């Protein structure tokens, strides 16, 4: 009768969420100043890649950015003068994640080879070389995020996230219980919790130190492709394969707002927030990115310069730019 | 500060002389999926398998590490030139499970330009599996080969040719000329299987160019 009592437990959380549900924020934020139409023009355009670009991560210096494409190249750009600082070749041609270290010294990438590699780029001996590869996953890697210069969390396609250690190559903790390809992850500002969306329409809050699960959010109806995090640490947004972004608050354990329109039939592939958390940038499959307001769902601005898809998107730590990589091998920096 | 910008463009143009050298070796190698298996029916003769026919580099990749669900990693093979779809001809209705995988590759939003090369393997064990199949497909008893010829037995020829026309009903229903299917039969005589992909990938580039020039 373990499944029979689970319906009593699942209906216990459902009616408890109606106890805290008093008014949606669309009725609360009805007395705020709207932002209106914004216009982002393409400032720079980094043209150095030969295949589809699957991930970029902006460095914490707000100057450099790493991008990864599926021809076996990891190019560290310089977003002010469009100069290629480095151009690393990879062992596997199919990569779908990349990450810049918050000290600037390291860079990471993984893909269909089930291996997170680490490349040390601030070396005084020679050129860039692979530091240590992390092979413990039985599925493709989807997202990589550095905690410090010694710890990294990697989500994979074998339903399990994993906190690693760069020294000795061993997994410190592990996170199980998604039942779906974990497609992305994010990180907290204080770096003690992290969320992870997967292919079972369920984002899931975790714990780095304890290695346990805190909460589980279920409001989507298809596979979750991207996730981000609100800058204060109290909420996160989540885009899925059904043209809907939903803002979940992790202190009321339910949704706040749903960002959708009538004439959008594509899916989200990238979600990020601004610096003040007022604009929500979302990349789509019909080649253009929309700029949703976070409080109202007013659909402020549309930026369109791409050709084949929009696969990745990022906002700098000072909020001065937005770079959208795409499947036509061109990064474009918007401002 | 002035010497820092001179050191920046010196490191820039050194990279540009390597990216343009790597571009001409990237556009000279043809990538290939292999969505069958490494079952040595068409695998030991030909993840990275690299061969070379007529001084052309081919890049065949058998993806095996992924577990069951392919709806997220198969869309990273949309810049490929062809998908090789090795499938055994001869329980639990293993043929219809491949008939629905081919129907899903053909109708994807991203693999709707890739042209499948279909290998109908396990051919030498089909003659033993036909003389004892027809209950799984009731239209097999009412079907006859119209005009094709040049195969042993007439019962095993009609049984083999029924499987090939089962795939072409899907391949000729929503193609619109952007991609075709290239069915073949092979069984352990796979010395003439490496050139069979070479002659088929040559026709994929030619029909790609002729349709761009509005000649097909």
């Amino acid at each position, epitope marked *: 009768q373990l499944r029979q009592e689970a319906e009593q437990l699942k209906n216990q959380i459902r009616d408890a969420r109606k106890a805290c549900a008093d008014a949606t924020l669309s009725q609360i934020t009805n007395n705020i100043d709207p932002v209106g139409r914004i216009q982002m023009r393409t400032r720079r355009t980094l043209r150095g890649h030969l295949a589809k670009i699957y991930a970029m991560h902006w460095g914490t210096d707000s100057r450099l950015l790493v991008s990864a494409s599926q021809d076996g190249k990891l190019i560290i750009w310089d977003s002010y003068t469009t100069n290629k600082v480095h151009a690393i070749p990879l062992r596997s041609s199919w990569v779908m994640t990349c990450a810049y270290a918050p000290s600037g010294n390291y860079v990471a990438c993984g893909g269909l080879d089930n291996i997170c590699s680490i490349y040390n780029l601030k070396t005084r001996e020679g050129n860039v070389r692979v530091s240590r590869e992390l092979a413990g996953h039985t599925g493709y890697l989807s997202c990589c995020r550095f905690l410090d210069d010694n710890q990294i969390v990697t989500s994979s396609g074998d339903t399990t996230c994993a906190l690693w250690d760069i020294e000795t190559g061993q997994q410190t903790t592990t996170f199980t219980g998604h039942t779906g390809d974990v497609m992305s992850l994010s990180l907290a500002p204080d770096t003690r919790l992290f969320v992870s969306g997967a292919c079972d329409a369920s984002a899931k809050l975790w714990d780095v130190r304890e290695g346990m699960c805190r909460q589980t959010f279920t409001g989507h*109806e298809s596979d979750i492709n991207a996730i981000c995090f609100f800058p204060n640490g109290n909420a996160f947004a989540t885009g899925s*394969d059904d043209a809907t972004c939903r803002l979940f608050d992790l202190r009321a354990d339910q949704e706040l707002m749903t960002y959708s329109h009538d004439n959008i039939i594509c899916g989200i592939t990238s979600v990020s927030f601004s610096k003040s958390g007022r604009l929500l940038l979302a990349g789509y499959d019909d080649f253009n990115c929309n700029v949703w307001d976070a409080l109202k769902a007013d659909r402020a601005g549309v930026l369109a310069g791409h050709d084949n898809r929009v696969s990745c998107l990022g906002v700098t730590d000072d909020g001065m730019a937005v770079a959208t990589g795409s499947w036509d091998s061109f990064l474009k920096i918007w401002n | 500060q002035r010497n820092e910008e001179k050191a920046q463009r010196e490191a820039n143009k050194k990279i540009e002389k390597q990216l343009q050298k790597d571009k001409q070796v990237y556009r000279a190698t043809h990538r290939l999926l292999l969505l069958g298996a490494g079952e040595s029916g068409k695998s030991t003769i030909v993840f990275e398998t690299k061969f070379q026919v007529d001084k052309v580099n081919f890049h065949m990749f058998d993806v095996g590490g992924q577990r*069951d669900e392919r709806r997220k990693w198969i869309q990273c093979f949309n810049d490929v030139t062809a998908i090789i779809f090795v499938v055994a001809s001869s329980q639990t209705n293993r043929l*219809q*499970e491949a008939l629905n995988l081919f129907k*899903s590759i053909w*109708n994807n939003r991203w693999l709707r330009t890739i042209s499948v090369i279909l290998f109908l393997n396990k051919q030498d064990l089909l003659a033993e599996k036909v003389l004892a199949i027809e209950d799984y497909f009731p*239209e097999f008893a009412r079907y006859t080969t119209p005009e094709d010829a040049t195969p042993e037995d007439p019962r095993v020829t009609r049984a083999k040719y029924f499987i090939r026309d089962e795939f072409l009903r899907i391949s000729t229903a929503s193609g619109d000329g952007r991609h075709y299917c290239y069915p073949h039969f092979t069984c352990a005589v796979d010395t003439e299987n490496i050139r069979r992909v070479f002659n088929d990938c040559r026709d994929i580039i030619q029909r790609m160019h002729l349709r761009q020039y509005e000649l097909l």
Partner: nanobody
Amino acid sequence: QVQLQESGGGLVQPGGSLRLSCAASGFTFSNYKMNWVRQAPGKGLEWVSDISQSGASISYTGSVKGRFTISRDNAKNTLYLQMNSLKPEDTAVYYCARCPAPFTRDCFDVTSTTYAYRGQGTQVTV
């Protein structure tokens, strides 16, 4: 929270009739293509039939052609499989799967296990 709850089934005589119904809550029913997947004891999962998101296209496994049928009702969100002329080789657990994405022509459907959009399955035996 998505839900695919099936009903019907039971132990009948070989040659009778059955009607399974699948009530779906949590998603818009009108814009997904639905499926019926059975699993025989000892065997893996095996696809049976499907239906498009409006009722136009309807396909079957050839081994169940003529006997079975499949219908939708997009106003009450229920998926039906009317079964006639059963057989001792038809005893299976019948799941009610669906497409992973809306407005989508293809589907990458049922696996070894752990497909995210599926029901518990009602036992059907003869």
